[model samples]
Target: KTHVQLSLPVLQVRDVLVRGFGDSVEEVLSEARQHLKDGTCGLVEVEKGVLPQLEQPYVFIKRSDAAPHGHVMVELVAELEGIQYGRSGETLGVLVPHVGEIPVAYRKVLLRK
Candidate 1:
């Protein structure tokens, strides 16, 4: 059995500017096929403009423990990025930093087209 069940790890929503439609971070992507992948989704080395411009969710690469504020603090210090969805690609996790990392201040719904 080379499959891993999602532990969910609890979700957080904060400082949200976009209202209505209670969507979460995990709901926004097609990711987390751990064994099938080859490498980690990895942390994106974003400059000043990257997260500000190209926002996108994953396990969030953390450098340390104990975040000061809320999830917003995680988004900032975590520098927010992905994990190992490298190969077969059942789903690819992404991090959105436009409003905040994951789902805060920024809200989105799923469109299955």
Candidate 2:
């Protein structure tokens, strides 16, 4: 697969370790390696049911909690290309510089769906 070009800068994510969904992480990581080599960085989409399962890990990093430095945490399954608020219920939209693209690229999965 070719690398996706985002308007935002790429994140420095290394050593992707998939938590659930069995060995699917292995296959995904393999694809990720290519993206990295091609000078692109982002999360690859996985199974839809896996999204909620992966949400908790994103929260861990979102709260400024520690993770292996330079590693971008992501749920194997996901969508979207912008900032989203609230886990559920009413949502709030706060404008930020760079049009929230960088942060969106950092937090959520940006796959070629």
Q: Report the number of the highest-lDDT candidate.
A: 2
Q: lDDT of candidate 1?
A: 0.26
lDDT of 2: 0.27
Q: What is the lDDT of residue 51 in candidate 1?
A: 38
Worst 10 residues of 2 by lDDT: 90-99
**Model 2: clashing residue pairs?**
46-76
Clash counts for all predictions: 13, 1
TM-score of each: 0.26, 0.23
- Model 1: residues >4 Å from true position, as ranges? 1-24, 28-37, 40-42, 57-59, 65-113
Worst 10 residues of 1 by lDDT: 104-113
lDDT of 2 at 72: 27
For model 2, residues 1-61, the per-residue Cα lDDT tens digits are 3222222232212222332222233433344334334534333233345344342222111
Task: Name the best candidate (by TM-score).
Answer: 1
